[PDB]
Amino acid sequence: PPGPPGPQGPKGDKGDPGPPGPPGPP
Amino acid sequence: PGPPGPPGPQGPKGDKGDPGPPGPPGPP
Amino acid sequence: PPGPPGPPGPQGPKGDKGDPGPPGPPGPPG
Numbered sequence: 540p541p542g543p544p545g546p547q548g549p550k551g552d553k554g555d556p557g558p559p560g561p562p563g564p565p
Numbered sequence: 566p567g568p569p570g571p572p573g574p575q576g577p578k579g580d581k582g583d584p585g586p587p588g589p590p591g592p593p
Numbered sequence: 594p595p596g597p598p599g600p601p602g603p604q605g606p607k608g609d610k611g612d613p614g615p616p617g618p619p620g621p622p623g
Contacts, residue, residue, distance in 0.1 A: 540567065541566075541567045541596050541597050541599050542567030542568045542569055542570065542595075542597070542598055542599030543566075543569050543570070543599045544569065544570055544599055544601065544602050544603070545569050545570035545571045545572050545573060545598075545599065545600065545601050545602035546572045546573065546602045547572070547573050547603050547604075547605055548572050548574045548575050548576060548602060548603065548604050548605030549572070549575045549576065549605045550575070550576055550605050550606045550607075550609075551575060551576035551578050551579060551606065551607045551608035552578045552579065552608045553608045553609050553611060554578060554580045554581050554608055554611030555581045555582065555611045556581075556611045556612045556614060557581060557582030557583045557584050557585060557611060557612065557613050557614035558584050558614045559584070559585050559614050559615050559617055559618070560584050560585035560586045560587050560588060560615065560616050560617030561584070561587050561588065562587070562588050562617050562620055562621070563587055563588035563589045563590045563617060563618070563619050563620030564587075564590050564591065564620045565591050565620050565621050565623050566595060567595055567598050567599050568598055568599070569598070569599055569602075570598050570599035570600045570601050570602060571598070571601055571602070572602050573601050573602035573603045573604050573605060574604050574605065575605050576604055576605035576606045576608065577607050577608070578608050579607055579608030579609050579610050580610045580611065581611050582610060582611030582613050583613045583614070584613070584614050585613050585614030585615045585616050586613070586616050586617065587616075587617050588616055588617030588618045588619050588620060589616070589619050589620065590619075590620050591619055591621045591622050591623050592619070592622055592623070593622065593623055
């Protein structure tokens with residue numbers, strides 16, 4: 540009989556860093 | 566009974582981060 | 594003998610959300 544399911548796969552890559560924030564107020 | 570199968574697939578890439586904080590108030 | 598290797602495991606977790614971006618530029622001189 541074939542054996543049990545394998546282990547959980549690795550975590551995905553971290554998402555890309557976000558963009559610079561907006562300018563401050565004048 | 567056979568041994569455990571190979572590892573599962575790598576998970577998907579995370580979501581893009583948020584835009585950063587607003588910059589500092591301008592000076593006079 | 595022991596049977597053939599079994600099925601693949603579950604999908605790994607999604608990656609963490611990315612870091613926030615850098616601070617925005619200083620506002621214009623008023």
